[PDB]
Amino acid sequence: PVYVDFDVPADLEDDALEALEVARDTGAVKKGTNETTKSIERGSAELVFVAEDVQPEEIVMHIPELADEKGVPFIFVEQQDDLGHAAGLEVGSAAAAVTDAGEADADVEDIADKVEELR
Amino acid sequence: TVLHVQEIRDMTPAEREAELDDLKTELLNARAVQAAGGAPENPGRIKELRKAIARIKTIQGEEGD
Amino acid sequence: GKKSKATKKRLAKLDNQNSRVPAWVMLKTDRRNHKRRHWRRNDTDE
Amino acid sequence: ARSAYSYIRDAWENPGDGQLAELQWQRQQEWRNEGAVERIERPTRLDKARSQGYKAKQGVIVARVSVRKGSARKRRHKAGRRSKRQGVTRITRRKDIQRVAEERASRTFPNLRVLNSYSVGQDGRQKWHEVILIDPNHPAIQNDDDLSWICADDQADRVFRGLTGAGRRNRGLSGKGKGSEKTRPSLRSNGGKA
Amino acid sequence: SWDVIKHPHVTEKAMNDMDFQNKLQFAVDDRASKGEVADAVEEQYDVTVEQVNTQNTMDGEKKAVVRLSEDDDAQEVASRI
RNA sequence: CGCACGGAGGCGAAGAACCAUGGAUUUCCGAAUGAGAAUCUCUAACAAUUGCUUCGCGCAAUGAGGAACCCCGAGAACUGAAACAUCUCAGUAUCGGGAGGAACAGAAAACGCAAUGUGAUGUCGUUAGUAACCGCGAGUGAACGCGAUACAGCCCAAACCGA
Numbered sequence: 055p056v057y058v059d060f061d062v063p064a065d066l067e068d069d070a071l072e073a074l075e076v077a078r079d080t081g082a083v084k085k086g087t088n089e090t091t092k093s094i095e096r097g098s099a100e101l102v103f104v105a106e107d108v109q110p111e112e113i114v115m116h117i118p119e120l121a122d123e124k125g126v127p128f129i130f131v132e133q134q135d136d137l138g139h140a141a142g143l144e145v146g147s148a149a150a151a152v153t154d155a156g157e158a159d160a161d162v163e164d165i166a167d168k169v170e171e172l173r
Numbered sequence: 174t175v176l177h178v179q180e181i182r183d184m185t186p187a188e189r190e191a192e193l194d195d196l197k198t199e200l201l202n203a204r205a206v207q208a209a210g211g212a213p214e215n216p217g218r219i220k221e222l223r224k225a226i227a228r229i230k231t232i233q234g235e236e237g238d
Numbered sequence: 239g240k241k242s243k244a245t246k247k248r249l250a251k252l253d254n255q256n257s258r259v260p261a262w263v264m265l266k267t268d269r270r271n272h273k274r275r276h277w278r279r280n281d282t283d284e
Numbered sequence: 285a286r287s288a289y290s291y292i293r294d295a296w297e298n299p300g301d302g303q304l305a306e307l308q309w310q311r312q313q314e315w316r317n318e319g320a321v322e323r324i325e326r327p328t329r330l331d332k333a334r335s336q337g338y339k340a341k342q343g344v345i346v347a348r349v350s351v352r353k354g355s356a357r358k359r360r361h362k363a364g365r366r367s368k369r370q371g372v373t374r375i376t377r378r379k380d381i382q383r384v385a386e387e388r389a390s391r392t393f394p395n396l397r398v399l400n401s402y403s404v405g406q407d408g409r410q411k412w413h414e415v416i417l418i419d420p421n422h423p424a425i426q427n428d429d430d431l432s433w434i435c436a437d438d439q440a441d442r443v444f445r446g447l448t449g450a451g452r453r454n455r456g457l458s459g460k461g462k463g464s465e466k467t468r469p470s471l472r473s474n475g476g477k478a
Numbered sequence: 479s480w481d482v483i484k485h486p487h488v489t490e491k492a493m494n495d496m497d498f499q500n501k502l503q504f505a506v507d508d509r510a511s512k513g514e515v516a517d518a519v520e521e522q523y524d525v526t527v528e529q530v531n532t533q534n535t536m537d538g539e540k541k542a543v544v545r546l547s548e549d550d551d552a553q554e555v556a557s558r559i
Numbered sequence: 560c561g562c563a564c565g566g567a568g569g570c571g572a573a574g575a576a577c578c579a580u581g582g583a584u585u586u587c588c589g590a591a592u593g594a595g596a597a598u599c600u601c602u603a604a605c606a607a608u609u610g611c612u613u614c615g616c617g618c619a620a621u622g623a624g625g626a627a628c629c630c631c632g633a634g635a636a637c638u639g640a641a642a643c644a645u646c647u648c649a650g651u652a653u654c655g656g657g658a659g660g661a662a663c664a665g666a667a668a669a670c671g672c673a674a675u676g677u678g679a680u681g682u683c684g685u686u687a688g689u690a691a692c693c694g695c696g697a698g699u700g701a702a703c704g705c706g707a708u709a710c711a712g713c714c715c716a717a718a719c720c721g722a
């Protein structure tokens with residue numbers, strides 16, 4: 055909430071999670087805040103996801119500004135376990151990063167373009 | 174003395190129970206005579222009555238009843 | 239005063255402890271009850 | 285590359301600046317309405333915890349503990365005293381607030397043992413710390429080559445005897461040379477002179 | 479485990495109740511109730527108990543005055559053991 | 560067949576007594592834990608606080624004792640100074656909390672005989688009543704090094720991996 059500065063419509067989120075699932079099967083994804091961080095830092099990240107129900111918030115605060123100084127696009131998600139289930143985990147994840155999509159490079163670009171418009 | 178360990182172990186899980194209530198009854202009737210200040214006492218016998226019951230109970234425990 | 243069941247068991251014991259050293263013990267030891275208590279002169283606990 | 289953890293750390297160098305500033309303002313409001321010892325599912329400062337020994341595992345516990353700010357809460361002398369010993373106001377205790385929080389936490393969890401602790405801030409009248417406790421009886425820990433040592437009998441009630449980290453420092457055992465003549469191997473053995 | 483009946487109380491007063499009132503006096507365990515005293519008496523002598531009266535004597539023990547029915551005879555029972 | 564040399568009687572060659580080890584039994588109150596109570600009572604119980612969890616007291620933990628020793632906190636005054644306030648008695652007496660068969664300490668952000676030198680920690684001897692403190696009064700008071708005892712060094716957080 056302190057790191058969140060815009061709300062993402064449930065319908066958009068649905069699109070985003072659908073694409074991430076096909077991204078784990080086709081392309082490659084990074085699960086976990088740490089791995090997501092080095093992705094932005096190394097550049098290999100194309101689209102990064104960040105959960106909204108994170109407590110403590112310190113685990114994620116850095117993502118928004120970091121992605122900004124690296125040109126990497128990012129999107130929010132309501133629940134932590136939905137992002138984890140989408141990434142293909144028995145547990146939830148505070149954040150996920152699509153390290154080079156696959157069979158979805160089109161959608162990823164759309165979502166990225168859609169968000170920029172959503173501010 | 175008049176009752177040996179071997180003889181107790183030779184008993185069945187039922188014989189010891191019968192022999193138990195038997196001894197207990199002899200004891201009670203001894204203490205009944207003693208209660209009335211009876212003279213046909215045999216101090217060594219009443220003593221042995223207590224130990225016998227202890228032995229049978231001790232064996233019962235070892236044997237699983 | 240009203241004595242309880244436990245209190246009663248204790249007075250009962252003290253009264254028994256008040257007996258004398260049996261005559262046969264004097265002989266077996268070839269020759270005193272230091273705990274002889276009196277209701278008036280002495281004072282039990284409680 | 286920097287670990288994600290290095291970011292939690294950096295924010296906490298300046299708890300008064302940035303987002304952390306706004307975060308703290310919000311949190312404390314709920315904290316002031318909580319108890320003295322509140323068990324919490326996740327550490328407020330991941331980097332510090334893990335650095336101290338923390339592990340996302342069965343038998344590893346955390347609890348926030350608030351203690352009042354300031355000097356000793358001493359009662360004035362009631363009998364004869366020479367001027368030197370008539371003080372009340374400027375007297376402070378020899379144990380530090382962090383070591384006090386560690387104790388109040390270990391008493392709340394009589395089966396657990398203190399591992400370490402850190403500070404999570406303070407307002408105008410109280411300080412909050414987060415203690416890390418460990419269940420010496422859980423087999424998940426008894427087979428951990430990193431935490432099994434805290435199962436030994438001689439580790440029983442370790443906090444109350446100053447064997448904790450904040451404990452050993454408060455006992456003036458940091459330095460190995462000059463200035464540590466009366467502190468090592470113990471305060472009591474050196475006639476209580478530090 | 480403790481046994482209910484310890485032994486028969488044989489005194490002159492105990493004989494009067496026997497000869498005159500068909501009562502047998504016993505020294506029993508102080509944890510035993512009137513009901514538990516009656517039962518034990520009937521099982522140890524094969525008689526019918528009508529009434530029981532108790533007293534916690536100054537001898538650390540419980541005294542029970544067990545009254546037999548007209549069907550049984552106190553004097554005949556006590557005289558056998 | 561206790562101390563305990565009586566009386567009566569009994570036990571032992573079916574090897575008792577006696578001793579060593581292991582076992583059976585082991586009332587009530589007691590940390591005392593189902594609830595109450597001057598060792599008893601009333602109608603099934605890990606009470607209370609915790610961990611795990613099949614979220615059910617299902618599996619566990621704590622509690623109290625011990626001759627002193629040990630560790631972490633609280634902390635006098637008589638007294639000395641020929642009065643007395645800082646100082647001294649003393650971090651002593653005593654108080655709160657806690658561990659063990661011993662505790663604590665411990666592998667350098669060290670030492671600083673300044674070196675081209677030493678190399679975790681205790682402890683003993685010495686250094687030395689030396690340096691340092693102090694109404695610079697009375698008093699207080701180390702360490703480095705050395706000779707010995709005994710010796711033993713290792714594990715994480717992170718980087719890079721990512722179930």
Ligand SMILES: [Cl-]
Nearest residue numbers: 397398442443
């Ligand atoms: Cl502890």
Ligand SMILES: [Cl-]
Nearest residue numbers: 670676677704
């Ligand atoms: Cl040297």
Ligand SMILES: [K+]
Nearest residue numbers: 365366636647
């Ligand atoms: K003084």
Ligand SMILES: [Mg+2]
Nearest residue numbers: 253254256257
């Ligand atoms: Mg009399």
Ligand SMILES: [Mg+2]
Nearest residue numbers: 469470473663
């Ligand atoms: Mg020592």
Ligand SMILES: [Mg+2]
Nearest residue numbers: 531532533534
């Ligand atoms: Mg009555």
Ligand SMILES: [Mg+2]
Nearest residue numbers: 591593594595
């Ligand atoms: Mg009770």
Ligand SMILES: [Mg+2]
Nearest residue numbers: 639640641642
């Ligand atoms: Mg003087």
Ligand SMILES: [Mg+2]
Nearest residue numbers: 477649650699
């Ligand atoms: Mg001094």
Ligand SMILES: [Mg+2]
Nearest residue numbers: 640694696697
């Ligand atoms: Mg002077």
Ligand SMILES: [Mg+2]
Nearest residue numbers: 461462702703
């Ligand atoms: Mg030095």
Ligand code: NA
Nearest residue numbers: 277278280281
């Ligand atoms: Na009297």
Ligand code: NA
Nearest residue numbers: 390393394396
């Ligand atoms: Na504890």
Ligand code: NA
Nearest residue numbers: 466476477478
């Ligand atoms: Na000091």
Ligand code: NA
Nearest residue numbers: 484505537539
């Ligand atoms: Na009697």
Ligand code: NA
Nearest residue numbers: 582583584585
């Ligand atoms: Na025993």
